[PDB]
């Protein structure tokens, strides 16, 4: 089968947006008056760092980002030259809701708004190359029920 | 030259299907990310592709549960990848 | 007994990513379905799983084009499958 | 690797909702005054029939269905006993828009409303078994642009 070229060293960048402190959200957004900080999230950032460095990616961590700050970070990588890279990874660790993720300030960022910044037209140097996004967040407040098997 | 879709070659790994919660153990990390890294570390050296690895993550996370609410978690990948995706260790 | 998520084991094969059109040739059929069946007929006998086959469909459809509008089409699978899915011929 | 059991004969049902005539939509829905019939769709239904019968599935075709008619058909299969089946497939061939598919009458059916009818709780006899949906329809009116590679 055809396989994506994956031999560059580093393979490419692995962004890690790690949101822990939601004090701004609790104070600014009424319905988020009781949203709690994401204790333990650093364990995820550390695991991702170790895992992808082992896989030859260059890790770029960013902690506690508001929505505006997230878009700024993505713009920087959208405009960056990935010509010598074979892949691009972006990991988002935060709170979320249906189809969105929350910035530390409680503002919403549509998932599509995040991934669309790296399409072939917007980031030509990544055209034809795999763009991987891992999103760790709720996508609603419903508990997924179980079924016996 | 040749042309492909503007939105080709994307892989989106969601910790959960829409409308539902995803879990985080303050002393261990989240169900999804911890499972993802464990699977990547164990399977990439074997040459398994990402779709196969994410399928295993779906299996592993599907076996975990939140007693307090009898809750479960179902990860969900979406992709426009046009080729097999592997992360060689060499 | 054991419990798994209510929404586990699903495979959704979309002819196109959201917001965009999918093509239909009145004299041949649609780009997606025709490519899907051709890939299934050719690869299932080989033992390839559905995710691998759908990846090939993404590749094939991505190479087609609509001259009149310089348009393309990008199929998109989404899944909660927990195991490899194959359709044996025997 | 673990693999889904796929040895039953037939493997299971393969529904094919094939919408061609949109006369009702053109007359009832104002914004669909010019939606055209889907000429050539029978070629898709035929290919799916041949392909999946070859793969040992029992084909269940349904032509020109309104949204209400689609829900009725899905309810029948949701309540059916799939105990002796190892899989379930549903193919939808119709017009569509963002996150929905159109019935021949121009009414909308959210994709989620279609797939959710077969969750483990709603269709216990399919619990633990693969449920596959193939959706052939537009998901908007935008032309996907190309990029050189």
Torsion, Cα of D39, D44, D45, D47 (10° steps): 140
Place of tokens 């530390």: A104
The answer to whether residue D123 is catalytic is no
Q: Residue A61: in which H helix or E strand, if any?
A: strand A58-63
Taking Cα atoms as reference points, which of D75, C63, D21, C82 lies closest to residue B1? C63
Q: How far apart are CA A126 and CA A131, in angstroms?
A: 8
Q: Which method, experimentally, gave rise to this model?
A: X-ray
Is there a contact between D77 and D126 (Cβ–Cβ < 8 Å)? Answer: no
Q: How many domains is chain D built from?
A: 1
Token readout for A103 is: 């910035």
DSSP state of C8: -
CA–CA min distance B24, chain D (Å): 25
Domain ranges in chain B?
1-90
Q: CA geometry: angle at D7 spanning C47 and C3, to 5°?
A: 100
In DSSP notation, A92-145 reads EES-EETTEEE-TTS-EEEHHHHHGGGSTTT-GGGTTS-EEEEEES-SSSBPBP
Nearest CA in chain A to B65: A146
Assign a CATH topology to domain B1-90. Answer: Alpha-Beta Plaits (3.30.70)
D92 and D134 Cβ atoms separated by less than 8 Å: yes
Which member of B33, B70, B88 has the closest CB to residue A44?
B33
CA distance D138 to D98: 8
Cα-to-chain-centroid distance, residue A109: 11
Q: Which residues of A touch D147 (CB under 8 A)?
A: 119-121, 124, 127-128
3-class DSSP state of D52:
helix
Token pair, residue A35, equals: 């949203």
DSSP chain B: --EEETT-SEEEEESS-TTB---EETTTEEHHHHHHHHHHHHHGGGT--HHHHHHHHHHHHHT--BGGGTBB---EEEE---SB------
Cβ of B70: how many Cβ atoms within 10 Å? Answer: 11
By CB atoms closer than 10 A (0-12, 13-18, 19+), residue C2 is exposed
Six-digit token pair at A51?
A: 């895992």
CATH number at residue A29: 3.40.50.1460
- C-alpha–C-alpha distance, residues A45 and C81, integer Å: 26
Q: What domain range is A85 assigned to?
A: 1-149
Give residues 27 to 86 of C whose Cβ lies within 8 Å of D. Answer: 27-30, 32-34, 36-37, 40-41, 44, 49-50, 65-66, 69-74, 81-86
CA pseudo-torsion sign A129, A135, A140, A146? positive
Q: Which residue has the tokens 């529904």?
A: D15
Q: Find all residues with CB under 8 Å of D2, minimum gap 6, and list them.
A: B59, C82, C83, C84
Contacts of B68 (CB under 8 A, 6+ apart): none
Catalytic residue status for D91: no
Give me C9's structure tokens.
Answer: 């084991």
Tokens of A28: 């600014």
Helix, strand and coil percent figures for chain A, each rounded to 5: 30, 25, 45
The tokens of D86 are what? 């190892």
For this entry, resolution in Å reads 2.0
Rounded-to-integer distance, Cα A2 and Cα D127, Å: 34
């Amino acid at each position: 089968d055809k396989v994506y070229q994956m031999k560059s060293k580093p393979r490419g960048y692995c962004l890690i947006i790690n949101n822990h402190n939601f004090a701004k959200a609790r104070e600014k957004v009424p319905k988020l008056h009781s949203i709690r900080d994401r204790n333990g999230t650093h364990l995820d950032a550390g695991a991702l760092t170790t895992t992808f460095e082992e896989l030859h990616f260059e890790i770029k961590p960013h902690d506690d980002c508001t929505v505006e700050q997230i878009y700024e970070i993505l713009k920087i990588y959208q405009l960056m030259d990935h010509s010598n890279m074979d892949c691009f990874i972006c990991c988002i660790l935060s709170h979320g809701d249906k189809g969105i993720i929350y910035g530390t300030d409680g503002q919403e960022a549509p998932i599509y708004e995040l991934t669309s910044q790296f399409t072939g037209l917007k980031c030509p140097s990544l055209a034809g190359k795999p763009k991987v996004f891992f999103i760790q967040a709720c996508q609603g407040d419903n508990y997924q029920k179980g079924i016996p098997v | 030259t040749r042309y492909i879709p503007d939105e080709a070659d994307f892989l989106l790994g969601m910790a959960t299907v829409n409308n539902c919660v995803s879990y985080r153990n303050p002393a261990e990390g989240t169900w999804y990310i911890q499972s993802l890294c464990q699977s990547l570390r164990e399977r990439c050296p074997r040459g398994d592709d990402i779709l196969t690895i994410l399928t295993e993550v779906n299996y592993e996370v599907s076996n975990k549960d939140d007693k307090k609410n009898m809750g479960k978690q179902m990860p969900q990948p979406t992709f426009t990848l046009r080729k097999k995706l592997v992360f060689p260790s060499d």
